[PDB]
């Protein structure tokens, strides 16, 4: 009987552990994807800032 209880508890524990790991990993992955995409857009804004800065360095000529 105690072995039966031990196996039920083991099943519950590892169900919980694997699900928690999966949800943590998914949160990390989606966060990294968004972050990469946000920083890419920011670098794009930067190139935009650079070129608009450049326009001011030719009119003074």
């Amino acid at each position: 009987i105690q072995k039966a209880i031990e196996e039920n508890n083991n099943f519950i524990k590892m169900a919980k552990e694997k699900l928690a790991q999966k949800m943590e990993s998914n949160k990390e992955n989606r966060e990294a994807h968004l972050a990469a995409m946000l920083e890419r857009l920011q670098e794009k804004d930067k190139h935009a800032e650079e070129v608009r800065k450049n326009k001011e360095l030719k009119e003074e000529a």
Binding site: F11, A15, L19, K22, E28, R30, H33
Partner: protein, 440 residues
């Protein structure tokens, strides 16, 4: 005592649940306002129908059910529909955005936002139970909700209710009546994720239901309503042993004992007869032998596969209506002497029979005819592995090019989950191959 909580997930699960609960009401004489003149036990009772219906002091009979969808379109129809009165509003749960046929959204991105509330409502239902027996989960393989959120819920229920029984009624995707080309992906993923948390799952192939509706009911182009009403008839046959009770009744757990030789081999094939129009039924009373014969014509199966090319591990017949053991045994003898029923060498060849006396009813104005007797066969056969193979093939065609995979990775998933699920499916296919091999 021995209550069952039904959980209907996604569009398919919700609409099938509508069909099933309407049919249950008609079967038990429960009105759309929840009242049942038959029941003189006000506020409660241990009657058989109480396994699926709780009672209020005001005499309402409330389904032991909770409907969940990540978008409100489908459940709103319930809230405003004919049976709006049956359900406490807390039993109807809706999000705002759906899973867009993406398993990741159903399991992780949107599902996590509502899983705790759904579990709380399920707990509220379970706390009313004096001896809860298990859960019945209705869902589709192909939808993002019906796959991902169903899988997440099954994991969580395994945690919160231990090994307590969880049965599935799962809609297998038809190649041509679907909204999504990525349904093989979701099917494989959810089958992999829930395989350890389901004790028994009844797959319903929409292509089989569609063909049955066309051939047997002369319906040019069946709708979701036609398929759902037929599916409700099958679910009713499977659950009648739980909801009714009599001398010859055999309780679904007793069949479950025979139908599952190993924990992974828990996918029975369901066949149902008679499916016949009112026009064809007139002056065509169908005998026990005739419907029993129909049970072995593969065109009546819920899943398109060939039992005759596999081996039987179990065969159960669930009759309901005007049926007695003499006729059942006679028909079974004729079938045994005239059909290809090849059992694996390691299990007996007998047929397990149960009979409920309450006759099948039908939704008024539906296309299915009212009949005096009907039968549902539940057989564990290796042939159902074909349904896996087919799907595993479609998956393989896309994943080789990673077609559509970016939609899942974008929602936080990894290709490793895809590969792990596919390998689990391959192991399942070889398990089904192995069980059929002969001993030495």
């Amino acid at each position: 005592m021995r209550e069952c909580i039904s959980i209907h997930v996604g569009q398919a699960g919700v609409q099938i649940g509508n069909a099933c609960w309407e049919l249950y009401c008609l079967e038990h004489g429960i009105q759309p306002d929840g009242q049942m003149p038959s029941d003189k036990t006000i506020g409660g009772g241990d009657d058989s129908f109480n396994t699926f219906f709780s009672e209020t002091g005001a005499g309402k009979h409330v389904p032991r059910a909770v409907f969940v969808d990540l978008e409100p379109t489908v459940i709103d129809e319930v809230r405003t529909g004919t049976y709006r009165q049956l359900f406490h509003p807390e039993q109807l749960i809706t999000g705002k955005e759906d899973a867009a046929n993406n398993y990741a959204r159903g399991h992780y991105t949107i599902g996590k936002e509502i899983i705790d509330l759904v579990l709380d409502r399920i707990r509220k239902l379970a706390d009313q139970c004096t001896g809860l027996q298990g859960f019945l989960v209705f869902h589709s393989f192909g939808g993002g909700t019906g796959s991902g959120f169903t899988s997440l819920l099954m994991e969580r229920l395994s945690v919160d209710y231990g090994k307590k029984s969880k049965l599935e009624f799962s809609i297998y995707p038809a190649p041509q009546v679907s909204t999504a080309v990525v349904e093989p992906y979701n099917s494989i993923l959810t089958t992999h994720t829930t395989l350890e948390h389901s004790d028994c799952a009844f797959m319903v192939d929409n292509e089989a239901i569609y063909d049955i509706c066309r051939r047997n009911l002369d319906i040019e182009r069946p709708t979701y309503t036609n398929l759902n009403r037929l599916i409700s008839q099958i679910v009713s046959s499977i659950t009648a042993s739980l909801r009714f009770d009599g001398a010859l009744n055999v309780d679904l757990t007793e069949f479950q004992t025979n139908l599952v030789p190993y924990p992974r081999i828990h996918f029975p094939l369901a066949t149902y007869a008679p499916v016949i129009s009112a026009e064809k039924a007139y002056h065509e009373q169908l005998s026990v032998a005739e419907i029993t014969n129909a049970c072995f014509e593969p065109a009546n199966q819920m899943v398109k596969c060939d039992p005759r090319h596999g081996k039987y591990m179990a065969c159960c017949l669930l009759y309901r209506g005007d049926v007695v053991p003499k006729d059942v045994n006679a028909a079974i003898a004729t079938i045994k002497t005239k059909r290809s029923i090849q059992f694996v060498d390691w299990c007996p060849t007998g047929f397990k029979v149960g009979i409920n006396y309450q006759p099948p009813t039908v939704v008024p104005g539906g296309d299915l005819a009212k009949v005096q007797r009907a039968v549902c066969m539940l057989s564990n056969t290796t042939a159902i592995a074909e349904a896996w193979a087919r799907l595993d093939h479609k998956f393989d065609l896309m994943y080789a090019k990673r077609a559509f995979v970016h939609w899942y990775v974008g929602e936080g998933m990894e290709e490793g989950e895809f590969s792990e699920a596919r390998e689990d499916m391959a192991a399942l296919e070889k398990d089904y191959e192995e069980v059929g091999v002969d001993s030495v």
